[PDB]
Design a protein around this ligand. Sequence first.
Ligand code: MG
Ligand code: MG
Ligand code: MG
Lengths: 347, 350
Amino acid sequence: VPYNLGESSVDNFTLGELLNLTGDRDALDQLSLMNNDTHGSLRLREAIASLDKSVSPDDILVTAGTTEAILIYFKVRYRSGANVVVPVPTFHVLYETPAFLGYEVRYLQLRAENGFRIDPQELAKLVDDNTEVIVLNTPQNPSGVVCSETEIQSIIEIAEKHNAEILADEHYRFLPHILPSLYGLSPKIISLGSTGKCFGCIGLRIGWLIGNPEIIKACHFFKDYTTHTVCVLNDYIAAGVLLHKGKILPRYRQMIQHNIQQFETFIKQQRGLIDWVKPEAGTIAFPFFTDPNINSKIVAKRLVEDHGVLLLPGEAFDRPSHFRIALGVEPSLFQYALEKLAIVIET
Amino acid sequence: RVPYNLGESSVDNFTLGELLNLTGDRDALDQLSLMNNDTHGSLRLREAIASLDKSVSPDDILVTAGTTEAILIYFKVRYRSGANVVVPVPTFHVLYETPAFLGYEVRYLQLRAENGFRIDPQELAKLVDDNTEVIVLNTPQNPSGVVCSETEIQSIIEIAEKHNAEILADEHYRFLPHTEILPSLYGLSPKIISLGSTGKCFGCIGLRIGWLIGNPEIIKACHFFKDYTTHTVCVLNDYIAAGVLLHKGKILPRYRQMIQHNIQQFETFIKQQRGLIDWVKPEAGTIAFPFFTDPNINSKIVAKRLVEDHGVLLLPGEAFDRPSHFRIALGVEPSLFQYALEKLAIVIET
Ligand SMILES: [Mg+2]
Ligand SMILES: [Mg+2]
Ligand SMILES: [Mg+2]
């Protein structure tokens, strides 16, 4: 569809556009197509580590996207009778991969009436001594909510009291409306990051895991049975992306804030029919119809067939009144999408 | 990290620039969008893969990040409680260790140098029962280089079709026969799932491009579960691997030439060793699995002393539970191969 607002990545570069910003074009031809460093290249791991003082280049395992990292981590920490706590709505892999691996998945239902925020007392009611992982996706996909320092501190306290690790999916830390990594805040925190969603190069398939030496050694071992290594080419391009983030992220931040303002104007024009928890960071928002009778699936279907505008209906997150909309698109397409959405609402 | 590594199963790898000079794909890379690739792999790559055999259509192919991912996805989708897999060993460790991780009962079919590392049909039927879901068929074999004959293939198909077990045909090394490439086994029976890759044969193992070839239902099931391993492969690797296949005639003859020169060099080396060294002569692929005919020397300590004193790495046969054997790469420069043989003779003498 020409007006696709249903993705969680920003508008992607071409390879040539990206290399004109990173300067990495001439170095690519000398790269060897032998197997990459199995932890990821030092250049990429040092570029990742430079984002946070708490992170050293040896704490990092580069994976083929965070999807692979999620799989390897949950496999390593699996044991019979273990459970994972997943706040939902979130990226589906974060609860489906543990389920595939045999985990008992305990869902923490986040809701727009509570600002999609984690209540520590409701999380402590889900964590026991068999809880091995608490998933913490911040900034959140689809809400865009950033966990406050006190919510994090309460989660750290629940996790350290039950010896549960915290899987902090920090995919969207690069686009505040960068956010510091949670990796240093507690020994139980394992951090996930990626260039994909924030830098206009989701197709590079570069993610990383940050953890203590034993979880890194265990994840590195099992990666031999998923993809072995990531390509030196994607590795090298992703590293230059991070080292030149100042040529990429501010432009996307500017696009997102224009689209946030455009959606707030759209909220005023809809006069209470549309609301949202205003996002704090990332590439997406999760607005909702304030009418419990309208189903976003039927609005979205008419919008994509009659106008070619794609919004992700909230049923994909079991929130039928909501829909996710991409903020990292050109503001003209964003505004065009809202104007067609207003037409579907009016009729 | 040792400069004279003969312990790998890939051929000498290109730099990206060396490969692009052969495929002509350099100028096209800049226009590629970094959005998500086609989740089956690009049509350009799947058409290039499919063009290798009449039995293969572009819709039968799922591109993965190496065959390691395809192996994980395939065994996951086909797993059920109480299922077993039959794996001829020695073979690539992932082919039996990944099923073990997924809960399969792994039944090993010991391949043997006294039998030419060939599959015995009567010994395979004694391992396949009604609970066998997969029979692994690595041809050409890693580490032996043995190609399964036409009669061995039909006998395996008959054991598989009588117990309704699938055949996972790892055809990684079909591009380097010692015909231009070996024919795919995919069309030979509806139970055969084919795995292929450009990595080991084309000098670009680092691209991480593999593929699975199967019926529409296994493709759909594998495509679904790929969303939980890597989602998609990069459009850049996809594009380069397609050009590798479309220009295989500009790439493979050099490696075939290197391998046959090294096969001749090792045959001269066997004669110089006067019965101390033997092998099942490889028929295809990038590797050989020679052995010492002396039951007293341990190949692991020979390899240990060879790398420390000469910087030459051979893979000791203990890695395949064949202590008298060692694996040696044939897809290296013949000058480096000869250097390795001349230093291996020095370690042997003392
Ligand atoms: Mg640092
Ligand atoms: Mg516990
Ligand atoms: Mg064909």
